[PDB]
Structure 1
Amino acid sequence: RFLKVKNWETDVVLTDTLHLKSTLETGCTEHICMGSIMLPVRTKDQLFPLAKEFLDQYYSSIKRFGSKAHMDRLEEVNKEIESTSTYQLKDTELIYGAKHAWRNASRCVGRIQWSKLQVFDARDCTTAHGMFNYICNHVKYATNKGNLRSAITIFPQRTDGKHDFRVWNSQLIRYAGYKQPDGSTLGDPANVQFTEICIQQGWKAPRGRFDVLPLLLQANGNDPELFQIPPELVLEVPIRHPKFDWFKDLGLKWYGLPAVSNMLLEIGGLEFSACPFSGWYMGTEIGVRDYCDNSRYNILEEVAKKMDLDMRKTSSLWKDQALVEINIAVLYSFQSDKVTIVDHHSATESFIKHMENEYRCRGGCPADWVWIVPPMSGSITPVFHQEMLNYRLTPSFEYQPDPWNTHVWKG
């Protein structure tokens, strides 16, 4: 079967066949679309099919499908599963798998870059201190003094589900948030619960507005342990504006390295519960969401005040005006400091070129419109006008619940 998507700006029509390979579910049915819903131990029997599906894809990609090497590898994995109840990936399969999880990530606008991913194999890791060391090396490699490089570090896979490796941080680098007795928040309200956990575990909180959180690291199902990332490894950018000299006195800064640490990587049925990955920022992630969400730093008012916009009625579009100036500031700042960043116009244009390429060479590109369209200036970006099909391919990145909700505390 063939599904078509149309671009309503260019009238380019594309044909998807790749969707024939999805099997996981969307949340939607013939009666209800859940496209805007944020969140819509295995057995041997389920495992070998998943392994086989993956190895068939891997061997096809290297043009060795049905070779002796492919067949010997299937037999080898089959025997390993029946005997040990799991299997180990070869390094080449791990690299291919991690790259494909990114390629398959339907909410990711930056996927043009998918084939350029540095994979660090941390499956020999055994302790939280070992995890800390791997993560520092990742951060230093990825940061590359501002010339950012995409990377992923993969810790040992799930076994019985009682021995999981987890990074409790949602990102490797993030700022603390402190709920005050008066109900106000100091720092980032997104990270209050995690900050309280760090404090409880013994972190000495500086109690400022941009305090880089400590890593909380769990190895082999053990209780997690705290570590401070060496400050010299954490690249930060002070935010200033090209024309507005008072912008700097808002005291804003942000970190250069976006590094997701709380997702689960599935490759061939295996589950990598600690797999931190990092790329570089699109400016709106900081300028629109991190700074301007009401539930985050919430700076729109102070910026509009300083700009002397008419704030008595929403129809002056003062919020819209201040929003643009903040985003100019973020891009100007990163560029001035030679820290990699991409604007939402460039990133969405590259994404459309990536998407069209994927259609031609792969037969599709699953994409989640709700997430791909930037949170400002939506229809002046080409993705707004692009119909997309969202479906689930593996290898994949998945949400997993926060570990403080599920961890069995040892003592």
Structure 2
Amino acid sequence: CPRFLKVKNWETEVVLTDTLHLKSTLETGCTEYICMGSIMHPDVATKDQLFPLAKEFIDQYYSSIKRFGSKAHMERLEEVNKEIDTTSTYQLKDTELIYGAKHAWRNASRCVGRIQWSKLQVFDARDCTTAHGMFNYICNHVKYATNKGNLRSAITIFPQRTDGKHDFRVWNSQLIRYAGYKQPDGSTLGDPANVQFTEICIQQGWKPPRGRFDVLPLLLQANGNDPELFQIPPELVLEVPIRHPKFEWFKDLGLKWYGLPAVSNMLLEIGGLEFSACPFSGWYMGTEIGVRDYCDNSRYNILEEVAKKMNLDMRKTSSLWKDQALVEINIAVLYSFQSDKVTIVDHHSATESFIKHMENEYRCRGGCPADWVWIVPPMSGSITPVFHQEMLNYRLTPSFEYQPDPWNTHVWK
């Protein structure tokens, strides 16, 4: 592998030099002959597998605190090694847990929000034993991160995997999401993305209000036991009704969205350890709501109704009625969040911040892994600076990974 790789920005002519790719760990999916960069997704560690993974992480941590090679570094290596020897696993120190969580975000190639990576509040929930305790930790997380609309990024880390039969899992894909209900006539009420999970909740005992914006309950699994349902206290769920600065009729669509984006189905890998329940939250980029949640054909799919109320000609695609309506919806989302003083970032500001972040990471860290397919926003791509920015994608650890949906693997008791 070449020692230096160059990326160019075709708008500004700036050339950056990447050396950090030499620390790349796992596989991208690509080969010399095929690129899988647009593919969305392209039994535990043995003692022998765990030793080198832990050492790599411990070495990285002690290098970051400028104590590489120190007595405390060598002693930490020996203590971890003994622990892996006698128990087949090991426990992270609190400092190492925090460092690992921040760096999994720092390394998340698909995240445009990483300029914030070092300001992550880490909640250590490794003492949790029950689904009720998970609910308590999650409620505290949601309250802290929401902060009356002055949102603060945060992660809550539940106990790591042991033998794979005692996993902690949040069955929700996000902590706060709206239910979706398939109707006998084929239509869907609510969010079509969540129909499968909604049906699971109903079978587990949830009584669904069957509305358009019903906050789903938490479905929480502790220590490999069957998951249990809990209702998030509604006063902890900050929501924003969507209105438009010019179009008085926009509020009559009855749209609203929740303020806190909180991913809860990913796995956090630190030093070979696997944290299968690690819900983390930030704040929204407006297009995540205004383009994807609202205008995806397979989601709320409101382009039609908005275009109608805008009195656009919808018979020819070349009138760009979809495009025109999409912008108004995204204007409404940003205006409504700003009016209610709920943190949100538009796609222009976020991508400009990410370029500055990337350049800083290249200069101070030797690179910044980035997934262009995900970094470029889903509207107006080429009038954002990331569109013209060449990027290198590679996998560094600590990392957030996808994992199978737990209902596909769980052994019901």
CA distances 1:158-195 after superposition (whole Å, capped 9, x unpaired): 00000000000000000000000000000000000000
Shift of 1:266: 0.2
TM-score for both structures, normalised by structure 2: 0.99
1:353, distance to aligned residue in structure 2 (A) = 0.0
Structure 2 alignment gaps of length 5 or more: none
Q: Distance in 2 between matches of 1:316 and 1:267?
A: 51
Match of 1:96 in 2: 99
- Per-residue Cα deviation, 1:123-167 (whole angstroms, up to 9, x for no partner): 000000000000000000000000000000000000000000000
Deviation at 1:23, TM superposition (A): 1.7
CA deviation string 1:83-130 (max 9, x = no partner):
000000000000000000000000000000000000000000000000
Number of aligned residue pairs:
410
Structure-to-structure mapping, 1:337-376, within 5 angstroms: 337-376=340-379
Which residue does the alignment assign to 1:4? Answer: 6
Q: Distance in 2 between matches of 1:36 and 1:319?
A: 24
Alignment partner of 1:181: what SS?
A: coil
Question: What CA deviation, in whole Å up to 9, does each residue of 1:189-225 have, x standing for no partner?
Answer: 0000000000000000000000000000000000000
The residue number in structure 2 matching 1:128 is 131
Q: Quick one: distance in 2 between partners of 1:133 and 1:204?
A: 22
Of the three residues 108, 112, 117, the one matched with 2:111 is 108
Partners of 1:190 and 1:310 in 2: how far apart? Answer: 29
Matches of 1:68 and 1:57 in 2, distance apart? 15
Matches within 5 A, 1:125-204: 125-204=128-207
Give 1:226 shift. Answer: 0.0
Q: Distance in 1 between matches of 2:51 and 2:125?
A: 24
Separation of aligned partners in 2, 1:160 and 1:310: 60
**Counterparts of 1:348 and 1:119, CA distance in 2:** 25
2:207 pairs with 1:207:
no
Task: Give CA deviations for 1:40-76 in whole Å, capped at 9, x if unaligned.
Answer: 0110001010000000000000000000000000000
TM-score (norm 1): 1.00
- 1:240 Cα deviation (Å)? 0.1
SS of the aligned residue for 1:226 comes to: strand
Post-superposition shift, 1:376?
0.1
How far, CA to CA, are the matches of 1:202 and 1:214 in structure 2?
A: 10
Distance of 2:40 and 2:124 partners within structure 1: 30
Q: Which runs of 5+ in 1 are unaligned?
A: none
User: 2: distance between equivalents of 1:287 and 1:47?
Assistant: 43
The residue that corresponds to 1:327 in the other structure is 330
The answer to whether residue 412 in structure 2 is matched with residue 409 in structure 1 is yes
Indicate the SS of the match to 2:268.
strand
Q: Give a deviation string over 1:281-315, Cα, whole Å, max 9, x none.
A: 00000000000000000000000000001111000
Structure 1 segments of 4 or more deviating over 4 A?
Answer: none
Query: SS of the counterpart of 1:254?
Result: strand
Per-residue CA deviation, residues 336-380 of structure 1 (Å, 9 max, x unaligned), is 000000000000000000000000000000000000000000000
Give the drift of 1:258.
0.1
- Post-superposition offset of 1:244: 0.1
In structure 2, C-alpha distance between the alignment counterparts of 1:84 and 1:36, rounded to whole Å: 41
Instruction: Find the aligned partners of 1:262 and 1:274 in 2 and give their Cα distance.
Output: 7
Aligned partner of 1:216 in structure 2 is: 219
Quote the Cα distance in structure 1 between the aligned partners of 2:230 and 2:315.
Answer: 47
1:236, CA displacement in angstroms?
0.2
Determine the C-alpha separation between the residues in 1 that align with 2:345 and 2:303. 22
Q: 1:259 aligns with which of 257, 262, 268?
A: 262
Equivalence for 2:16: 14
Q: Secondary structure at the match of 2:274?
A: strand
How far apart, in 1, do the equivalents of 2:25 and 2:58 lie?
16
1:383 aligns with 2:386: yes
